[PDB]
Amino acid sequence: QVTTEAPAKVVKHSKKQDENIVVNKFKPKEPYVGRCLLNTKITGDDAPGETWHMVFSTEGEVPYREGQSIGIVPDGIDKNGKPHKLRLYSIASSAIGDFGDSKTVSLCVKRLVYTNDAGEVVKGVCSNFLCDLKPGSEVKITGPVGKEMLMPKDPNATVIMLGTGTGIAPFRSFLWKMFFEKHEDYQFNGLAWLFLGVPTSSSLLYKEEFEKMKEKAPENFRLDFAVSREQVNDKGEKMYIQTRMAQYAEELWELLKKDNTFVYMCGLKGMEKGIDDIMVSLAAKDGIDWIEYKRTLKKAEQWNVEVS
Numbered sequence: 228q229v230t231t232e233a234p235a236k237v238v239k240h241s242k243k244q245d246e247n248i249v250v251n252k253f254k255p256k257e258p259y260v261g262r263c264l265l266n267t268k269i270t271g272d273d274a275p276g277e278t279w280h281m282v283f284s285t286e287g288e289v290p291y292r293e294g295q296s297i298g299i300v301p302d303g304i305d306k307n308g309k310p311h312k313l314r315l316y317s318i319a320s321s322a323i324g325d326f327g328d329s330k331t332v333s334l335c336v337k338r339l340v341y342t343n344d345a346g347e348v349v350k351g352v353c354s355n356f357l358c359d360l361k362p363g364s365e366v367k368i369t370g371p372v373g374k375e376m377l378m379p380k381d382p383n384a385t386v387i388m389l390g391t392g393t394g395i396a397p398f399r400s401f402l403w404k405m406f407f408e409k410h411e412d413y414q415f416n417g418l419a420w421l422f423l424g425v426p427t428s429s430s431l432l433y434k435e436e437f438e439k440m441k442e443k444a445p446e447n448f449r450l451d452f453a454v455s456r457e458q459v460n461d462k463g464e465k466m467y468i469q470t471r472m473a474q475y476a477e478e479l480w481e482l483l484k485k486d487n488t489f490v491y492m493c494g495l496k497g498m499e500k501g502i503d504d505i506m507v508s509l510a511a512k513d514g515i516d517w518i519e520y521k522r523t524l525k526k527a528e529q530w531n532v533e534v535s
């Protein structure tokens with residue numbers, strides 16, 4: 228008698244792809260050092276700000292999956308001669324990545340530029356270091372991090388993706404795995420519906436890629452853009468993400484009542500409210516309380532949020 232079955236720890240059941248997931252392999256103490264393969268501006272010269280897509284070599288050392296983030300320790304020192312703290316960035320590439328070899332990682336980065344009260348133009352440290360990164364240069368990577376935005380295991384589930392700006396990143400990751408890749412253990416056949424809010428047409432992130440996916444899965448891939456500074460509803464209201472969702476109120480509510488519907492939200496912290504305003508009305512007319520219904524969804528792993 229050399230064996231025994233040690234009593235199992237009690238554990239919560241998960242509908243998301245978390246089998247053998249990995250977080251915090253690399254710490255800022257000793258980050259993984261990768262290199263820049265490419266770094267391109269994906270927004271028009273005319274857009275209000277610049278958004279860049281960049282790819283780094285990982286030689287397969289960072290075991291990330293769709294929905295996770297990585298931290299970046301930008302080169303340099305702060306005002307006190309100290310190294311910079313890491314900044315997190317949502318992975319914009321699928322697990323196998325942009326080269327299809329599982330040895331790279333991609334980021335979608337907004338270059339932060341603003342002016343303080345003193346009237347001075349200020350440049351965000353990490354975002355400007357990243358957008359200025361030249362191919363061939365090293366970059367310090369930490370993580371992976373996150374489990375909230377992991378994809379659902381069900382290959383026939385409806386996945387509603389709500390994003391603003393660079394919040395599109397994890398959704399480009401999901402969609403590549405869903406429509407640009409042939410997976411043995413996972414071939415997507417549900418409904419993927421993406422809503423993306425950006426300020427202008429020159430700001431439509433990954434427009435061409437999404438159009439190729441629509442042209443490849445015209446039935447089960449739905450795409451709706453909400454261009455806030457160019458589009459307007461019948462009342463002249465700016466077309467924010469919730470304003471566009473409003474045009475499909477009946478359908479979305481109907482999907483939200485389905486048990487295989489998962490909603491994911493990523494991007495601006497403020498997008499969360501307009502969406503709830505929209506939802507509270509629908510549930511109301513349906514004699515349902517969104518407050519309570521949302522709680523259920525969240526506990527059922529069907530209302531996933533990662534905003535900041």
Ligand SMILES: Cc1cc2nc3c(=O)[nH]c(=O)nc-3n(C[C@H](O)[C@H](O)[C@H](O)COP(=O)(O)OP(=O)(O)OC[C@H]3O[C@@H](n4cnc5c(N)ncnc54)[C@H](O)[C@@H]3O)c2cc1C
Binds near residue numbers: 316336338340353393
């Ligand atoms: C989980 C997670 C994932 C993220 N993923 C992404 C991603 O994929 N892409 C992406 O672009 N960003 C992402 N971010 C944000 C990112 O981590 C950085 O915060 C961002 O790039 C800005 O950092 P920075 O180092 O450039 O700026 P910093 O040097 O840190 O400066 C930011 C500071 O400047 C001030 N500030 C910022 N904006 C303004 C403004 N308009 N006016 C006045 N003051 C201002 C604030 O005090 C703020 O604390 C994510 C955030 C989190 C938490």
Ligand SMILES: NC(=O)C1=CN([C@@H]2O[C@H](COP(=O)(O)OP(=O)(O)OC[C@H]3O[C@@H](n4cnc5c(N)ncnc54)[C@H](OP(=O)(O)O)[C@@H]3O)[C@@H](O)[C@H]2O)C=CC1
Binds near residue numbers: 469
């Ligand atoms: N995992 C995470 O937590 C992630 C978080 N983020 C967060 O998102 C930020 C990226 O923003 P960036 O790409 O510059 O986006 P933007 O400032 O470019 O704007 C995004 C779009 O959303 C609109 N918008 C602004 N406020 C709201 C609101 N309250 N409700 C609905 N729509 C709104 C804007 O309209 P208009 O400009 O006309 O007002 C704009 O069209 C990052 O700095 C980060 O903080 C990004 C990626 C991942």
